[PDB]
Amino acid sequence: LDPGLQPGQFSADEAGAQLFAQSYQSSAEQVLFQSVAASWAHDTNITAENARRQEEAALLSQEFAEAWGQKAKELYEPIWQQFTDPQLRRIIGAVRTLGSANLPLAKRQQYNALLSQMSRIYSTAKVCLTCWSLDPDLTNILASSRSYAMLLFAWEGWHNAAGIPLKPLYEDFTALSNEAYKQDGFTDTGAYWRSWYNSPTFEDDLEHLYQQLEPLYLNLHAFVRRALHRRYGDRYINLRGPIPAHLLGDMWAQTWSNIYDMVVPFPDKPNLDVTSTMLQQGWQATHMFRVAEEFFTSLELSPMPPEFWEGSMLEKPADGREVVCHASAWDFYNRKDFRIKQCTRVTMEQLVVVHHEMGHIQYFLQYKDLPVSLREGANPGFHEAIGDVLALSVSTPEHLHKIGLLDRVTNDTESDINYLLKMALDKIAFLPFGYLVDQWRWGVFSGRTPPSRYNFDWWYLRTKYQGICPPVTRNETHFDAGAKFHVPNVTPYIRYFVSFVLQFQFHEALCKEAGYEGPLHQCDIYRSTKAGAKLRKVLRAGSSRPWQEVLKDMVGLDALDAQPLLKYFQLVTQWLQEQNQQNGEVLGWPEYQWHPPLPDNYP
Ligand SMILES: *[C@@H]1O[C@H](CO[C@@H]2O[C@@H](C)[C@@H](O)[C@@H](O)[C@@H]2O)[C@@H](O[C@@H]2O[C@H](CO)[C@@H](O[C@@H]3O[C@H](CO)[C@@H](O)[C@H](O)[C@@H]3O)[C@H](O)[C@H]2NC(C)=O)[C@H](O)[C@H]1NC(C)=O
Ligand SMILES: C[C@H](N[C@H](C(=O)O)[C@@H]1CCCN1C(=O)[C@@H](N)CC(=O)O)C(=O)N1CCC[C@H]1C(=O)O
Ligand SMILES: *[C@@H]1O[C@H](CO)[C@@H](O[C@@H]2O[C@H](CO)[C@@H](O)[C@H](O)[C@H]2NC(C)=O)[C@H](O)[C@H]1NC(C)=O
Ligand SMILES: *[C@@H]1O[C@H](CO[C@@H]2O[C@@H](C)[C@@H](O)[C@@H](O)[C@@H]2O)[C@@H](O)[C@H](O)[C@H]1NC(C)=O
Ligand SMILES: [Ca+2]
Ligand SMILES: [Cl-]
Ligand SMILES: [Zn+2]
C-alpha cells in the first residue's frame, strides 16, 4: 500500500474517529476510482490484459480495506456503537466490515479471479447454428419470433451456453464468500446481504407483501395463458399447467411486455406499443438519453454533466469488440466522472431502461458531496426505484402524446384497461421473479441448497412462484440460475422486488405534492418543481439516515406498503377477475408436473 494511502494514528475517542473518517475519505476516493476505472476498461473492452489489470486493482482495494478496517477496530471497537454522531457510527460501522479483505492473500487472488472468469463467461457466451450473442440477437428472437421451435432453440441454446460452464466456478465462489463474511460475524453471505435493510422481521414482512400481490399475478397469468393457447394450441399449452418458459417475450420470462399484441383487449383504441413510431421517426440512442434528461431537468433536478456525455458508451461497439452489454450506471467516486454503459436498442422498453439507469446517475449526482461510506441509497430498493418512478409518468398516453409518440388521445374505460394491462405485463409479471431469485441464493449461501440441488431448487421456485416450466428436460449438469446476469456478476436481487412495490408509494406521494387530483394511473409529474424538490430531499440523504425515517418524511409511512400499487391497478385487477371467471379459467397450475413435448424433428 503506497505510503500516502496508509492509516496513521488518531486518538481513541469520538473526536479522533471524526479525524480518522476524514483521512479515510481522502484516500478512499483514490482507491475506489482506480478500481472503478479498471472495471470500466474491462467491461467496455473484454480482454485478458484488461482482466489482469482489474484483478490487480481489486487486490489493491482489499489491501486498503484491511489496513483501514484493522485500524478502525484497534481504536474504536469497544466504543463506536455509543458515539453521539449517528452519521459517524454508520461510517465506522462500514469501515470495520472487511468482506473479502478478510481472506488471506492466496484466497483473495482466487476470489478476484473467479469474479473475472464468471463475468467473461456470461458476457461472451454465444449460440451457434455463425453465432448469435444474447444482446441483440437472442433478445430480438425471444421478443419477436412466434415460432415455438425457434424460440426453443434460442432459449435452450442460451441456458446451455452460459449456465453449464459457470457451475464449478459458482460453487467455489460461494464457499470463499461465506468464509470471508463469517469473519465479520455473519452466519453466511445471505445474512450480510439481508442486514442492509435493518429489519429483524425482513423475510416475514416480504412474505406478507407477496400474499397481497399473488392474486393479481394469478389472474394475469391465467389470462395470458389463454391467449397463448389460442395461438400455440393444446399440444404446447396446458390450460391447467405451467406456461412453457420461452413463450413470454423475454429470456427469463420476467417481463411480458413483448406479447402485448397477443393480449390487448381493445385493439381499435390508440396503439400503445410506440416502438414502431420510434423507428418510423428515426429515434437513435442519443435521442433517448436526451429525452430522459429533459424529464429530470423539467423537475429542476440536475442535467447530465459533460463528463457523462464524453465518457459513456450508449451503443454496442461495431469495431469487433467484446463488451458487457447488460446496461449499467457508474459512479467513479471522484465527484466528477459518472457514466452509463448500455447496448441501447430503439424500443419503448429500452426507453424505460434508459430512465432506470439515469435514475441511478441522478442519485450519484445528488449525494456526491457526502462522505464516501454514505454515498448509497437509503436502502438498495430506493436506488432501484428512482428512474422507474419517473418512467411511470413518461409511459402515460397523455405524456407520450406530448413527446410525439401517440398522435391520438382518448380518455375512456377501454383505453384505461389497455394501458393498465400493458403496465401489468411489466410490473405485475415481474413480482414473482423479483421475489424468488434471492430465495434461491439465500438457500445456496446457507447450505440448504448444495451443488447437488442447484437446478432442482431453482426450478422448484420458478414453478412455485412464476408458474412456468422448462420447455426441454433439465438435470443437474445444467445450471439455469447462472444464465441470469446477476448470479455470475454477484449482484443482489431482492432490491428489485422492494423497488417494484416502493415505486408506487413514491408515485402516489409525488403526484399529491404536484397537486394532481385525477386517477393515480393518469398522473404525470412532468414540469412539477414541487415534486422535484420532494424527490431531491430523498436523493441528497444518501444512507446518512435510517431508510424508515426517510420514507416517512416522503410518503407519511415508515414501512413498505402494497396499497398504492393495488390502488394504481384496481380497474384492471377487477376486469381480469371478471374475464377469467366468465371464461371458466382455473387460477394456478395444478398439473404441476406437466412439460410440453418436443417439436417433431427438433432441431
Ligand atoms: C379522464 O377522465 C376522468 C374522469 O372524469 C370524470 O368522469 C367523466 C365521465 C366526466 O364526467 C368528467 O367531467 C369527470 O370529471 C378524470 O378524472 C377526474 O379528474 C377530476 C380532476 O381533473 C377529478 O375532480 C376533482 O376531484 C377532487 C376530489 O377527488 C376535487 O377536490 C376537485 O375539485 C375535482 O373536482 C375527478 O375526481 C376525477 N375522476 C375520477 C373518477 O378519478 C381524468 O382527469 C381524465 N384524464 C385526463 C388525462 O384528462
Ligand atoms: C437493467 C438493470 N441493470 C442493473 C441495474 O441498473 O440495476 C445493473 C446491473 C446490476 C447493477 N446495475 C447497475 O447499474 C448498478 N451499478 C446500480 C448501482 O450501482 O446502484 C437490471 O438488471 N434491471 C433493471 C430492473 C430489473 C433488472 C433486470 O433487468 O433483471
Ligand atoms: C482494448 O484493450 C487493449 C488492451 O487489452 C488495448 O490495446 C492497447 O492499445 C494501445 C493503443 O494506444 C496500445 O498502445 C497497447 O500496446 C495495446 N495493448 C495491447 C496489450 O495490445 C486496446 O487499445 C483497447 N481498445 C479500445 C478500443 O480501447
Ligand atoms: C443431462 O442432460 C444432458 C443433455 O440433455 C439430454 O439430451 C437431450 C438431447 C435430451 O435427451 C434431454 O432430455 C437430456 O436431458 C445429457 O448429456 C446428460 O447425460 C444428462 N445427465 C447428466 C447426469 O448429465
Ligand atoms: Ca454501486
Ligand atoms: Cl439488496
Ligand atoms: Zn438499477
Curated annotation (Swiss-Prot):
Induction (UniProt): Up-regulated in failing heart.
Result for mutant: residue 495 to Q: Abolished dependence to chloride, leading to reduced peptidyl dipeptidase activity
Result of changing residue 357 to D: Abolished peptidase activity, leading to increased levels of amyloid-beta
Active site residues of this protein: 357, 486
Binding site for Zn(2+) 1: 356, 360, 384
Post-translational modification: Phosphorylated on tyrosine residues on its extracellular part, promoting cleavage by secretase enzymes and formation of the soluble form (Angiotensin-converting enzyme, soluble form).
Binding site for chloride 1: 197, 495
Subunit description: Monomer and homodimer; homodimerizes following binding to an inhibitor. Interacts with calmodulin (CALM1, CALM2 or CALM3); interaction takes place in the cytoplasmic region and regulates phosphorylation and proteolytic cleavage.
Associated pathology: Ischemic stroke: A stroke is an acute neurologic event leading to death of neural tissue of the brain and resulting in loss of motor, sensory and/or cognitive function. Ischemic strokes, resulting from vascular occlusion, is considered to be a highly complex disease consisting of a group of heterogeneous disorders with multiple genetic and environmental risk factors. Renal tubular dysgenesis: Autosomal recessive severe disorder of renal tubular development characterized by persistent fetal anuria and perinatal death, probably due to pulmonary hypoplasia from early-onset oligohydramnios (the Potter phenotype).
Biological role stated in the UniProt entry: Dipeptidyl carboxypeptidase that removes dipeptides from the C-terminus of a variety of circulating hormones, such as angiotensin I, bradykinin or enkephalins, thereby playing a key role in the regulation of blood pressure, electrolyte homeostasis or synaptic plasticity. Composed of two similar catalytic domains, each possessing a functional active site, with different selectivity for substrates.
Protein name: Angiotensin-converting enzyme
Taxon lineage: Eukaryota, Metazoa, Chordata, Craniata, Vertebrata
Gene: ACE
